[PDB]
Single-chain antibody, 228 residues
Framework: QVQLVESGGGLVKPGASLKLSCKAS????????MHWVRQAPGKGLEWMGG????????NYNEKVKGRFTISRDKSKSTAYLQLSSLTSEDTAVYYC??????????????WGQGTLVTVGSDIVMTQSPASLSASLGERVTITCRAS??????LAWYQQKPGQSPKLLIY???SLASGVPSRFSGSGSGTDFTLTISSLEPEDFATYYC?????????FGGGTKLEIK
């Protein structure tokens, strides 16, 4: 029973500081990495940084490095994200997400529920189409393009409305455990695709791709797959 619980969000004024907390339970905290990814409309998913709890080492997205600080408390099984000099641009849902390895250049196997924060040389991942209407029992293929070669270091996530993302595929074509057989991914280099061989009602969602070849970790803008 993997559980990630974020807390500490709220409504703040420009220039404020805010500390977020992520409580991990149901697994050994020090065996996995801990990242912070934020999401807002029109801004998509944006990697903040991650930390390897046994080493206490962290990597950041250059756009927030020095302003935001990640830390951990191994005895508490908790990762933290310290926000500073907050601006209108930092308005987002802040997720903590687990990385299944000892590298900060990775994909995430579990995401928390998110905590809302409101203030009042990069590999570009592009997804197309932005939206696609489809009907049940149909085969659908969606695309993801990397601005430069990423070998097979690509992950696909599904996000249903009101929910956090869920891992579908990692390593471009490896299906995540418990994911239905109707999902497949293919590609290498810069050209990637996700296919659902026969749509089920649960498959109507937004799909994101993410590269984990270089820093910063970057996400595509998403494809919303909707009924008829």
């Amino acid at each position: 029973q993997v559980q990630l619980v974020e807390s500490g969000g709220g409504l703040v004024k420009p220039g404020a500081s805010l500390k977020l907390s992520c409580k991990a339970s149901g697994y050994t905290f020090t065996s996995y990495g801990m990242h912070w990814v934020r999401q807002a409309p029109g801004k998509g998913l944006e990697w903040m940084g991650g930390i390897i709890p046994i080493f206490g080492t962290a990597n950041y997205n250059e756009k927030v490095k020095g302003r935001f600080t990640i830390s951990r408390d191994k005895s508490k099984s908790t990762a933290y994200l310290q926000l500073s000099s907050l601006t209108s641009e930092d308005t987002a849902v802040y997720y903590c997400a687990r990385a299944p390895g000892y590298s900060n250049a990775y994909y995430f196997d579990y995401w928390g529920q998110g905590t809302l924060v409101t203030v009042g040389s990069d590999i570009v991942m592009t997804q197309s189409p932005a939206s696609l209407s489809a009907s049940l029992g149909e085969r659908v293929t969606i695309t993801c393009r990397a601005s430069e070669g990423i070998y097979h270091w690509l992950a696909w996530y599904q996000q249903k409305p009101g929910q956090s993302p869920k891992l579908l595929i990692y390593k471009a074509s490896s299906l995540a455990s418990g994911v239905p057989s109707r999902f497949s991914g293919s590609g290498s280099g810069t050209d990637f695709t996700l296919t659902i061989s026969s749509l089920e009602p649960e498959d109507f969602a937004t799909y994101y791709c993410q590269q984990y070849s270089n820093y910063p970790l970057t996400f595509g803008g998403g494809t919303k797959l909707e009924i008829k």
